Write a protein that binds this ligand. Structure first.
Ligand SMILES: N[C@@H](CCC(=O)N[C@@H](CS)C(=O)NCC(=O)O)C(=O)O
Ligand SMILES: N[C@@H](CCC(=O)N[C@@H](CS)C(=O)NCC(=O)O)C(=O)O
Ligand SMILES: [Ca+2]
Ligand SMILES: [Ca+2]
Ligand SMILES: [Pt+2]
Ligand SMILES: [Pt+2]
Ligand SMILES: [Pt+2]
Lengths: 210, 209
């Protein structure tokens, strides 16, 4: 059996990026799906460290927290910079991605109707830092940090993909980010995964909003 | 090194990394940014995500409090003994960060109306860290493994500020209580925590705690 198991709801959500990472890196894993019904029964939830999913298994190592899973795979698969300095820049990018993801999640689940207009208006100011990072790294022609892909690339890519669904054309103001999405999305193993039923037939979020 | 931390005159998101630096016998410079200086706008516009802290390690400039913690963790060897422990360290820190975010939201956006529900929910939010301790050397060492990690400093801060918010919140948790006492007694950290540099800063920037 595969050494990796992803335990999650039937959504892309906070597992989209780590799945893209595993697929693009040619790693095999198992998906264990948790229905809302099973979740509401409460026993799985009570057994989760912080009462939430995803849960991730790497052999007998059990992890929670999506960014913990990303960093773990980043370490073990060599997607965490070429040295200690790059590692810090990778973290700086991912923490930035996480900050915006939290705001996105808040909009989706708690304030979509009333909050969307304001959110989209504020969105360019939130995306600009990643354009800036790209512009300062080899003219934005490679990756978000250095000249090799990192776990932060997969997370940023997901963030950008879901925001294009939320606010179509939001990357028209950001040529480097736009080219970056096209470029990474064209990586053969990743392109195949993104096109597959395994990815396409899951909703982005759990409440039907996107 | 050398280290410079750039921040408002509060403990806030720099409390943990300061405890780390002090406990680890590191030297650093504080560049205090006043609210008036911040409102001028130029510094803010120059920050990657428009926020402090900003951190300098020689010619390396960092933003994001947890990036700074992880950087110090990796460079000073406060990140567990191997990859499996490093993952556990991240799991703790991400958990600490999740509760810190909830704390910050309470303090700055909903203190008066929201404190009652927050404090009622607090035991269930703290229990995971007690459980983690219980599963590591009976809670007698650190939150992960047998050596201190950056997650310890972050968790310690989280616990200290919650004792201020909700006195007695650790009384039902013997391992966390003993852990706070034990880490706080570490000589360099004890001296730092007792110093005006720590004591005479407010925890947050809006006078609430
Ligand atoms: N900080 C956590 C947050 C995880 C989280 O919010 N999980 C949600 C779904 S994405 C969940 O389990 N909701 C059910 C519940 O909280 O009871 C992470 O990064 O994984
Ligand atoms: N995720 C960031 C959040 C940083 C943050 O929230 N900084 C606040 C003070 S703690 C700030 O700069 N406020 C002023 C502003 O946003 O303009 C981190 O961990 O450092
Ligand atoms: Ca100074
Ligand atoms: Ca050590
Ligand atoms: Pt969040
Ligand atoms: Pt937050
Ligand atoms: Pt948050």
């Amino acid at each position: 059996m595969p050494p990796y198991t992803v335990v999650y709801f039937p959504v892309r959500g906070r597992c989209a990026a780590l799945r893209m990472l595993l697929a693009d890196q040619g790693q095999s894993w198992k998906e264990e799906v948790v229905t809302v019904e099973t979740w509401q029964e409460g026993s799985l939830k009570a057994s989760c460290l912080y009462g939430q999913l995803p849960k991730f298994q790497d052999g007998d190592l059990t992890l929670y927290q999506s960014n913990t899973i990303l960093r773990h795979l980043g370490r073990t698969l060599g997607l965490y910079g070429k040295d200690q300095q790059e590692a810090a820049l990778v973290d700086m990018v991912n923490d930035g991605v996480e900050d915006l993801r939290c705001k996105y999640i808040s909009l989706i689940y708690t304030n979509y109707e009333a909050g969307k207009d304001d959110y989209v208006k504020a969105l360019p100011g939130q995306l600009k830092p990643f354009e800036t990072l790209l512009s300062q790294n080899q003219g934005g022609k490679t990756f978000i940090v250095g000249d090799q892909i990192s776990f932060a690339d997969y997370n940023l890519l997901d963030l950008l993909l879901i925001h294009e669904v939320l606010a179509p054309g939001c990357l028209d103001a950001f040529p480097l980010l736009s080219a970056y999405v096209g470029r990474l999305s064209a990586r053969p193993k990743l392109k195949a995964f993104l096109a597959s039923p395994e990815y396409v037939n899951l909703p982005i979020n759990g409440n039907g909003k996107q």
